[PDB]
Amino acid sequence: AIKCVVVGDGAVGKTCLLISYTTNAFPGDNYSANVMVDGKPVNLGLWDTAGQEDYDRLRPLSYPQTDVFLICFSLVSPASFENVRAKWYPEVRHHCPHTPILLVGTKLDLRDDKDTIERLRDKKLAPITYPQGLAMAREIGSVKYLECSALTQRGLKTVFDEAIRAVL
């Protein structure tokens, strides 16, 4: 059994990431994947979390016995990205000083969307680029930086393959 916990700001796509991986369906708790690893079936337990401020005292109770964290931010929310540094990495790493952390950029499908880009440009903002995410990942000492889209499933299998590889 491997326990994986997904953390990050509200609305970055954590729930959709988990449901899309485990069910292969995109939505309109804790979940269960089986993965083969070198011809050995392995159970992967995926724990969703509430990223909101009003869960700040309760959320860390989910952290004990975690084998790997995914810190999620949305590739089209620069604020969710800044909070990796300002909130997420400092909380998880302090509470869990040795657990591997993967950094995952979500909503990869929106990064080249014209209207998402234009709405962002209105507030002097821009989607997060791969180089930017990679730099964040190295700064916080993440095992790996990965980008994905729960919606299209691009990159999604790799996220959980790499989560398991970090553990094993």
Ligand SMILES: Nc1nc2c(ncn2[C@@H]2O[C@H](COP(=O)(O)OP(=O)(O)O)[C@@H](O)[C@H]2O)c(=O)[nH]1
């Ligand atoms: N375009 C796109 N939208 C997504 C994706 N994942 C989640 N969303 C949307 O982002 C919003 C927040 O998703 P959710 O999984 O509930 O985020 P959570 O609050 O972090 O659990 C919802 O409207 C989802 O439909 C994705 O990969 N691509």
Ligand SMILES: Nc1nc2c(ncn2[C@@H]2O[C@H](COP(=O)(O)OP(=O)(O)O)[C@@H](O)[C@H]2O)c(=O)[nH]1
């Ligand atoms: N960076 C970080 N510091 C924290 C967190 N939670 C508590 N602290 C701080 O750690 C320091 C010592 O906390 P204390 O309860 O005495 O000791 P601890 O329980 O062994 O961590 C205080 O400054 C706390 O505010 C966290 O999630 N991240």
Ligand SMILES: Nc1nc2c(ncn2[C@@H]2O[C@H](COP(=O)(O)OP(=O)(O)O)[C@@H](O)[C@H]2O)c(=O)[nH]1
């Ligand atoms: N190893 C380690 N674990 C910590 C630390 N602070 C919190 N934890 C973990 O978080 C749990 C709750 O401890 P608590 O004192 O409420 O955390 P605080 O917010 O850092 O003061 C502990 O039982 C540990 O599992 C720390 O400084 N080192």
Ligand SMILES: Nc1nc2c(ncn2[C@@H]2O[C@H](COP(=O)(O)OP(=O)(O)O)[C@@H](O)[C@H]2O)c(=O)[nH]1
């Ligand atoms: N990899 C690694 N894991 C550790 C270490 N110390 C404790 N752990 C594990 O980290 C998790 C949290 O344990 P905790 O007592 O909070 O950490 P500690 O203060 O570093 O001993 C547990 O699963 C421990 O077995 C360490 O030095 N290295």
Ligand SMILES: Nc1nc2c(ncn2[C@@H]2O[C@H](COP(=O)(O)OP(=O)(O)O)[C@@H](O)[C@H]2O)c(=O)[nH]1
């Ligand atoms: N190694 C690397 N991968 C990237 C870079 N930019 C995007 N990707 C990844 O390659 C895949 C396609 O990303 P995308 O932004 O669509 O690249 P594009 O099709 O050339 O525009 C995704 O899995 C991304 O995570 C980059 O600069 N370096």
Ligand SMILES: [Ca+2]
């Ligand atoms: Ca502490």
Ligand SMILES: [Ca+2]
């Ligand atoms: Ca704390």
Ligand SMILES: [Ca+2]
């Ligand atoms: Ca330690």
Ligand SMILES: [Ca+2]
């Ligand atoms: Ca110590």
Ligand SMILES: [Ca+2]
């Ligand atoms: Ca200790």
Ligand SMILES: [Mg+2]
């Ligand atoms: Mg959710």
Ligand SMILES: [Mg+2]
């Ligand atoms: Mg301490």
